[PDB]
Amino acid sequence: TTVPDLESDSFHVDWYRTYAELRETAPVTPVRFLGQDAWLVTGYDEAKAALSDLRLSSDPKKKYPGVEVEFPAYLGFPEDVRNYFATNMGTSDPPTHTRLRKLVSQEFTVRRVEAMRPRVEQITAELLDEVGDSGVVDIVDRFAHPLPIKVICELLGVDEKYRGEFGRWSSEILVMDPERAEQRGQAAREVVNFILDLVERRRTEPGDDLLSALIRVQDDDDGRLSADELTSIALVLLLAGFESSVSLIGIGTYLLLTHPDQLALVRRDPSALPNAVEEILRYIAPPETTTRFAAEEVEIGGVAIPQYSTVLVANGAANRDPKQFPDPHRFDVTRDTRGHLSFGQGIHFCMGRPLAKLEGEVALRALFGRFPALSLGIDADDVVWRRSLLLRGIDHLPVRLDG
Numbered sequence: 316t317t318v319p320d321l322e323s324d325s326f327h328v329d330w331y332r333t334y335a336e337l338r339e340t341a342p343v344t345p346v347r348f349l350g351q352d353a354w355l356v357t358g359y360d361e362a363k364a365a366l367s368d369l370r371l372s373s374d375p376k377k378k379y380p381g382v383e384v385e386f387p388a389y390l391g392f393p394e395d396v397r398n399y400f401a402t403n404m405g406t407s408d409p410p411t412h413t414r415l416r417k418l419v420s421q422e423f424t425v426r427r428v429e430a431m432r433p434r435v436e437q438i439t440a441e442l443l444d445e446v447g448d449s450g451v452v453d454i455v456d457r458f459a460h461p462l463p464i465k466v467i468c469e470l471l472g473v474d475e476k477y478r479g480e481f482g483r484w485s486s487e488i489l490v491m492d493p494e495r496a497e498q499r500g501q502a503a504r505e506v507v508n509f510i511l512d513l514v515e516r517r518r519t520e521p522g523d524d525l526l527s528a529l530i531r532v533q534d535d536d537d538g539r540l541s542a543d544e545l546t547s548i549a550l551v552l553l554l555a556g557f558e559s560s561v562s563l564i565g566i567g568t569y570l571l572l573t574h575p576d577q578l579a580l581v582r583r584d585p586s587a588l589p590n591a592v593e594e595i596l597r598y599i600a601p602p603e604t605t606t607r608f609a610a611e612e613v614e615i616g617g618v619a620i621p622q623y624s625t626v627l628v629a630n631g632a633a634n635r636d637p638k639q640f641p642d643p644h645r646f647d648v649t650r651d652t653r654g655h656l657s658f659g660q661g662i663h664f665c666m667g668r669p670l671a672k673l674e675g676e677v678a679l680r681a682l683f684g685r686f687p688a689l690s691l692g693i694d695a696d697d698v699v700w701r702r703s704l705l706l707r708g709i710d711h712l713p714v715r716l717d718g
């Protein structure tokens with residue numbers, strides 16, 4: 316009947332209750348979003364099946380006769396800008412996806428990530444050193460946001476004097492408001508221009524960073540990254556490389572601050588921190604929904620998704636499907652979190668998982684270790700959640716350093 320409108324407050328206010336009510340009626344249902352028809356998948360089994368079915372494409376650049384492909388995430392994006400944003404692993408299907416991922420995997424290794432551990436630890440310490448010993452501060456602006464941004468910049472060879480602008484553009488892009496479609500596309504163009512200059516500088520002055528290495532990566536069979544591929548991969552690595560981690564740190568801080576019992580456990584047993592981060596991701600997945608396009612008719616959960624349909628796989632809703640995660644609304648750092656979809660599923664499974672876990676673990680351990688009496692600076696019910704189905708997070712979070 317009343318087709319769900321993903322722009323309504325129902326999806327940004329106690330929204331997991333909304334996902335539950337939909338999942339109960341039909342884990343695969345028609346919805347409206349940004350002026351287009353789509354299918355929302357809220358069931359865990361259904362979401363896993365969907366992400367595993369390659370008939371559900373990840374490429375927004377593919378053309379189909381008489382069809383105008385529109386991914387919600389590229390709202391307001393001029394075509395050329397979309398291409399700059401979508402010529403990488405996450406926006407490619409095999410065989411192209413296969414070679415792009417293989418080449419990037421040669422340099423974006425666990426070794427390279429672990430080599431940054433000392434840097435993550437030092438940056439974390441320095442940021443915490445600057446907030447003081449007492450009073451109220453915005454833990455996002457002073458910590459959760461600057462840490463990942465500095466880490467990804469060092470990984471991608473982005474000099475200090477070029478880190479003060481893209482954070483603002485990226486922020487505008489996380490929100491999908493039809494009212495600001497033009498501003499969103501303009502923010503996107505700035506990011507493109509920024510990446511074009513970064514690549515130019517790196518080709519001219521090589522270093523030991525990941526971008527420099529991708530400029531040189533090659534393989535007898537897979538070949539190498541074309542100029543367009545290199546540029547597009549650098550772009551998403553820059554944005555995806557810090558935004559999801561900022562969300563994790565902010566959400567994790569909020570969850571630990573509002574679940575004293577859970578925080579107590581993690582502290583008593585340090586070996587419990589890794590799974591705590593996994594549960595924080597299971598509880599409130601940053602990539603709440605991920606988009607796919609039906610290149611052919613595809614049946615999911617007994618529902619025939621018509622060919623050329625836009626499919627929104629609700630990774631977050633799937634993580635709260637009681638059939639997969641019993642007592643889903645309980646944040647439990649001890650639960651078996653295996654199988655959650657916050658890092659994806661299938662061929663597009665997160666390539667940054669090692670780094671995301673490293674940052675989350677280092678950041679939360681340091682923050683709560685430095686401030687044993689840390690407390691929320693506002694009522695839990697007054698925290699403002701980012702209005703985005705692309706990347707859920709917290710943009711401002713007051714905390715009292717000394718309780």
Ligand code: HEM
Nearest residue numbers: 404405555556559560563602657658659663665666667671
């Ligand atoms: C807590 C943080 C993170 C979360 C929640 C996360 C989540 C995800 C998810 C859900 C996917 C699959 C998307 C899809 O199926 O279309 C993905 C893909 C990917 N992530 Fe992450 N990610 C995180 C951190 C990172 C970081 C730090 C980087 C980069 C430095 C990164 C790089 C990528 C790349 C390149 C892919 C594309 C894989 C492919 O298409 O083959 N991620 N991530």
Ligand SMILES: CC[C@H]1OC(=O)[C@H](C)[C@@H](O)[C@H](C)[C@@H](O)[C@@H](C)C[C@@H](C)C(=O)[C@H](C)[C@@H](O)[C@H]1C
Nearest residue numbers: 388404405406488551554555558559602705706
């Ligand atoms: C504006 C649209 C794009 O969004 C972003 O880059 C966001 C800033 C990131 O946080 C997204 C949400 C990532 O965290 C991963 C889930 C997916 C990512 C790796 C992709 O490859 C994917 C194609 C992505 O680039 C687009 C959805």
